């Protein structure tokens, strides 16, 4: 008695969404798609949520003259796989409705990802995407009829390339798909820019920081910026991956602002630990700064089972205990090697000394050297002059050593009062504000 209901509403899924998309895509260009055609993301993740089932919607696909009304109603009525996923090509070649080729080569095929048998149909999904990649290649050699693949099926295409990813990942890696991607880039570079490269580039970094390491420098020459960032979700996790990069490129002062940006551009919900687990390794760069506040302003108790190392670790950060250092290391270094954590163990001592020198430096105008050699667990006055020079290391607040015997003649620095440095920066503040005025201009330009 429940399955006759998706016979109605799962039918109206393709009726409303797909029928409106294809029919309203046949005209009214660029309102052809992208007013409910790329409702596709959540309505088709929902198709994989909202609801035997496997052969039914994949038989008898390409018929004739547009009788999909009757054919999808047959798919409704029939509720009472070896050539079956290829049967949308085996009834006849599709031969009409080229906006429907990728659509029916995505939406019926993909629910086996959520069926999870992983043994016989992932190679059949590989074959179904050999068909759909034959569409992808043959759109410019055999389909010289109209656009139908940029304005609708490019936004469909990047989605089903994430589904390519979902298929390719569950068994192996991909290498041929990378030059195949850059060919897809070349047929999206100058004509019509798609994300695409950034999709499999997120995957590139995701499997490469696991397994290849030359390619950040190849990103450097490959950094076509793509300032469109329309979803902002892909762009958010793009910033997450490259912030892991600059953490492993040991770039920290950039990392704090760009990863705080990457967090605040996540509007996400569902507190299973998505935002939380991404955010923990995000503010590992703040563990690497030398400065981090108490993480009470960051914890969701669903993350608590994973951060059972992490709270005691930030305790070790705020303290300086070598016992706590090594104990958190050996005991609580599990579950983070899967993410990669052991670059903080070399410089947790640096975190200690920068936290201490921050407290003491903003605390004290003048300090003495052979007592700042005993504020923290320092070693010697030669180690203390050493660590004063290493405490500068970049251009920190004025600390001149009293170069006879007066240990240090440091003082506080001034002229941040309200004089020229803020009005040196306010041109750029209002440069950002006029950029938002350009956003207002484009707000007017949206119709």
């Amino acid at each position: 008695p429940p399955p006759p209901a998706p016979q109605d509403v799962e039918m109206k899924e393709e009726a409303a969404t797909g029928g409106g998309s294809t029919g309203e895509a046949d005209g009214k260009t660029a309102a052809a798609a992208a007013e409910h055609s790329q409702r596709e993301l959540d309505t088709v993740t929902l198709e994989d949520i909202k609801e035997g089932k496997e052969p039914r919607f994949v038989l008898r696909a390409l018929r004739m003259l547009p009788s999909t009304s009757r054919r999808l109603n047959h798919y409704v009525l029939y509720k009472a796989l070896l050539p079956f996923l290829e049967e949308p090509m085996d009834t006849e070649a599709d031969l009409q409705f080229r906006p429907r080729t990728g659509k029916a080569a995505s939406t019926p095929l993909l629910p086996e990802v959520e069926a999870y048998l992983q043994l016989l149909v992932v190679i059949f999904m590989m074959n179904s995407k050999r068909y759909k990649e034959a569409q992808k290649i043959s759109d410019d050699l055999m389909q010289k009829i109209s656009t139908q693949n940029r304005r609708a099926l490019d936004l469909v295409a990047a989605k089903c390339y994430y589904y390519h990813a979902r298929v390719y990942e569950f068994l192996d890696k991909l290498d041929v798909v990378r030059s195949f991607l850059h060919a897809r880039l070349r047929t999206a570079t100058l004509r019509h820019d798609a994300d695409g490269q950034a999709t499999l580039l997120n995957l590139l970094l995701r499997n490469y920081l696991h397994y290849s390491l030359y390619d950040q420098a190849e990103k450097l020459v490959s950094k076509s910026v793509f300032p469109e960032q329309a979803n902002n979700n892909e762009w958010a996790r793009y910033l997450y991956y490259t912030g892991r990069i600059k953490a492993i490129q040991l770039e920290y002062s950039e990392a704090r602002r760009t990863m705080t940006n990457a967090l605040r551009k996540a509007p996400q919900h569902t507190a299973v630990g998505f935002k939380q687990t991404v955010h923990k390794l995000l503010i590992v760069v703040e563990l690497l700064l030398g400065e981090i506040p108490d993480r009470l302003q960051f914890r969701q108790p669903s993350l608590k089972r994973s951060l059972m190392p992490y709270f005691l670790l930030t305790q070790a950060v705020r303290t300086g205990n070598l016992a706590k250092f090594n104990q958190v290391l050996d005991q609580f270094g599990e579950k983070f090697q899967a993410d990669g954590t052991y670059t903080l163990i070399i410089r947790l001592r640096h975190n200690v000394i920068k936290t201490g020198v921050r407290m003491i430096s903003l605390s004290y105008s003048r300090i003495s050297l052979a007592d700042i050699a005993q504020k923290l667990q320092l070693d010697s006055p030669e180690d203390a002059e050493f660590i004063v020079a290493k405490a500068i290391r970049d251009g920190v607040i004025e600390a001149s050593i009293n170069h006879e015997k007066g240990y240090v003649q440091s003082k506080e620095m001034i002229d941040i009062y309200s004089t020229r440095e803020p009005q040196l920066a306010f041109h750029q503040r209002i440069s950002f504000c006029l950029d938002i005025h350009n956003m207002s201009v484009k707000a007017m330009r949206f119709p």
Binding site: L250, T343, D383, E385
Partner: protein
């Protein structure tokens, strides 16, 4: 294969005619098959195994000859030979100290991004084994500390591995910031901080260094009486170019309306 291949195990490099004739030999080795497009019939990879090891010892013969582009040439090559498809690469004991010399000169030319890309291309063996990489990361703890004392305190334990050409470049890359703050003919001696250059009380070595290419700051001042940074302290002439920023700001207002 193809003799005079392993025949110089004891008489490795007394001569560059031996090593140049072996440059011609290895030239023909590179001309023997290819690099790595062929995998099956595994003996055609075992000549690549023997090529790996004779280019390890060729890098030994090329690091004996004190040559920078040849040794980094063979380093890029043998790095790509440890980027071979062979999962069955056996224990090559030259790997530890050739990566050690790579990492040693790699830090000696101040590539810490390349230091950590070396760390991240091998997270497995750099945990407890690979002691001639695990010892440069103890040195990375020492240089994490921002080393001038710990250069000597870590040079204490590298006495004989023929690291000499590159630990000399480490003793070059020890820095001169105290010379850039307080030195340049007088601070009586800066001896008690274990900085390598700042030893040797007054021979013409550190006299040459205290007078080296001038007095590293540059214009308008010495460090006999310090500038304490560099003496910039220019003006607020940039009030006029922020006034220019105001001009094109009003232009951008006009573009906005």
């Amino acid at each position: 294969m193809y003799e005079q291949l392993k025949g110089e195990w004891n008489r490795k490099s007394p001569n560059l005619s031996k090593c140049g004739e072996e440059l011609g030999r290895l030239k023909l080795v590179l001309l023997e098959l290819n690099f790595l497009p062929t995998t099956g019939t595994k003996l055609t990879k075992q000549q690549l195994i023997l090529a790996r090891d004779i280019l390890e010892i060729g890098a030994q013969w090329s690091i004996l000859r004190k040559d920078i582009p040849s040794f980094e040439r063979y380093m890029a090559q043998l790095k790509c030979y440890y980027f071979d498809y062979k999962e069955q690469l056996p224990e090559s004991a030259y790997m530890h100290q050739l990566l050690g010399l790579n990492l040693l000169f790699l830090l000696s030319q101040n590539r810490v991004a390349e230091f950590h890309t070396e760390l991240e291309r091998l997270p497995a063996k750099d945990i407890q084994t690979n002691v001639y990489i695990k010892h440069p990361v103890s040195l990375e703890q020492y240089l994490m500390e921002g080393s001038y004392n710990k250069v000597f305190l870590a040079k204490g334990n590298i006495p004989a591995e023929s690291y000499t050409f590159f630990i000399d470049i480490l003793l070059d890359t020890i820095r001169d910031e105290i010379a850039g703050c307080i030195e340049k003919a007088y601070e009586k001696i800066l001896f008690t901080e274990a900085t390598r250059i700042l030893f040797f009380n007054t021979p013409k070595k550190m006299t040459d260094y205290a007078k080296k290419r001038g007095w590293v700051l540059g214009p308008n001042n010495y460090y006999s009486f310090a500038s304490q940074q560099q003496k910039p302290e220019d003006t607020t002439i940039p009030s006029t170019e922020l006034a220019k920023q105001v001009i094109e700001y009003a232009r951008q207002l006009e573009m906005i309306v």
